[PDB]
Design a protein around this ligand. Structure first.
Ligand SMILES: O=C(O)Cc1csc2ccc3ccccc3c12
Ligand SMILES: O=C(O)Cc1csc2ccc3ccccc3c12
Lengths: 343, 343
């Protein structure tokens, strides 16, 4: 497929990415040990996911830039920017795993949990961030959209950080206070912490590289992409519990982590004073018994049905948004992405 | 004095800095709680130091830009960039205190050690970083040196991070291995982790704002400033032990922290097989008895004398560097700074 076939050339470019970044020890053998540590940080944290966001940069690029203007250097730059996106995500994940004390990521042990790393992962996360800008300078220094990408990456980081701050305030590390789990807060968290960098960033980057720097073009694409981002995260929350581990490829624990999941938000709106106490006394527990009890209150409230209803209405809304805001961009850009997200 | 008088206008501008940054909740009440947290992060971590680096931006600006080209808006921008420097430092300090598990900073409790903060300080540190770029956009978006400052701040961050990585590798959190405490490693650490952002960054920023964007002008200033940075840190290490708490305003613990101090590096070069074992069995201990023992081996090796000798030779070298590389810049720019560092 569009991704399956392109995913190969994208992942293989990583070797060049790492080479070019670890090429600073060239005229500076003094920082050699630091550069080696950097290479270990990159190879462990940037590899191992699905690379969809980075891949979305490359895919969108081919659909926005004319075939002739797609020389070897242009595609080289597109692969790099796509990788910068993955780097931005690695930066967040490494730091987020530390903040929430996670044990594993992608079935693999969290970088900071590795023997000899620990809190040093904080500096490792900052380096992943810095490599984003080192790569842009190395490959797009002479491009007319150089400053655009820099500002875009910086803005995405800030949004994500703001969203993470909001998330940390909403679901503390010891406050099951369901009072703040509102739908307005949930949407705000998803928008800033996930939607902006996951859906807008990748497409916006391809846009700038294609010369589409118009503020209106970006605002129109933003309206569409932020909406897909919200649906993506809502579906992700639903699947985290009612999903099938065989298909998804992972087990959910949002309930055990007192997460401000879409499910809990729905349950809070659809619960009587008695039901509230049931959730207010089961949300955030390692007891498989207390968790299964929660999943029970959800089914009883037919949340899965609500989700199904929301999904259909969501697919309709997004299709309407695409028809209205896609132009002048090729609708395929958004349609191809929506097809991968919606079931 | 030049600083003492200007320090007032600089510190007072902070209120405007915070106002302008916390003005994002304006058209977005949704992220209000996040913006309030941000304001607490800023007011606690950016205030409380001496502000010399930020101040050095303002001072250098007045000496590089003609009096007429110093309108109210130009000085406004200079104060902001100076504050961005302080923000970059706050970002490093907050993150460094967490990484080395410090208890206090500036006599005050480390932000992350505050009740309710903890590892969330990681996200707080990333925000301080982001505010640097938000301020540059807000005040220098239309300036011709905009991209210059962005690249400068990004480069300084990367250097500092690289230097921190090197430092973490050199003096682990449980490896008193004095084998890596060489002078070449010491100089590398100081250059990347301290000199670049502390001495080059501030002056380089004033340079770009003054239109001095020449690569040669910056390379010449870099040679001078990196040298002052090295001396600054060496003197700082010496004072950390042999200094007077009344004058310095703090007690040293580099020996107790197994720091790769200039002193220990000197001691390793000036120690016989028997003396080495003495240090190899006392460096990095909380026992005031074992620490005083170390200070003893230093005095015996007349390190203070060595430092004194190094200081004089250092002042001569730096003066030679200024006479050779200052032009076309006003020598005062470097002389004023050197006068503040050298005793
Ligand atoms: O990354 C995933 O695992 C979801 C996913 C599956 S396929 C796919 C295609 C494009 C994306 C863009 C942004 C975020 C996600 C995705 C995604
Ligand atoms: O910041 C300090 O405490 C040392 C100091 C004393 S006065 C002063 C003036 C300019 C500086 C520039 C960079 C770093 C330090 C300083 C510094």
């Amino acid at each position: 497929d569009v991704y399956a076939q392109e995913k190969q050339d994208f992942v293989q470019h990583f070797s060049q990415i790492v080479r070019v970044l670890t090429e600073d020890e060239m005229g500076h053998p003094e920082i050699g040990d630091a550069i080696a540590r950097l290479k270990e940080v990159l190879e462990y944290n940037a590899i191992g996911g699905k690379y969809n966001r980075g891949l979305t940069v490359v895919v969108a690029f081919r659909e926005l830039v004319e075939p002739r203007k797609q020389d070897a250097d242009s595609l080289q730059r597109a692969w790099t920017v796509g990788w910068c996106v993955e780097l931005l995500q690695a930066f967040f994940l490494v730091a987020d795993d530390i903040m929430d004390s996670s044990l594993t990521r992608r079935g693999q042990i969290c970088w900071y949990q590795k023997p000899g790393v620990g809190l040093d992962a904080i500096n490792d996360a900052n380096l992943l961030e810095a490599c984003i800008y080192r790569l842009l300078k190395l490959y797009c220094r002479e491009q007319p959209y150089y400053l655009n990408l820099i500002e875009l990456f910086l803005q995405s980081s800030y949004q994500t950080e703001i969203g993470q701050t909001l998330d940390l305030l909403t679901a503390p590390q010891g406050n099951v206070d369901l009072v703040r789990f509102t739908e307005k807060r949930y949407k705000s968290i998803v928008k800033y912490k996930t939607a902006f960098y996951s859906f807008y960033l990748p497409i916006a980057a391809a846009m700038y590289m294609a010369g589409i720097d118009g503020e209106k073009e970006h605002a129109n694409a933003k309206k569409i992409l932020l909406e897909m981002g919200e649906f993506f995260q809502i579906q992700d929350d639903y699947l985290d519990l009612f999903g099938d581990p065989s298909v998804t490829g992972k087990i959910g624990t949002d309930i055990q982590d007192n997460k401000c999941s879409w499910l809990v938000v729905q349950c809070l709106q659809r619960a009587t004073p008695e039901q509230y106490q049931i959730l207010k006394e089961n949300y955030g527990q390692k007891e498989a018994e207390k968790v299964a009890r929660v999943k029970a209150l959800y089914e009883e409230l037919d949340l899965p049905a609500v989700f199904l209803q929301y999904e259909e209405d969501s697919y309709s809304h997004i299709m309407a948004l695409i028809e209205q805001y896609a132009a002048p961009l090729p609708p395929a850009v958004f349609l191809g992405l929506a097809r991968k997200i919606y079931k």
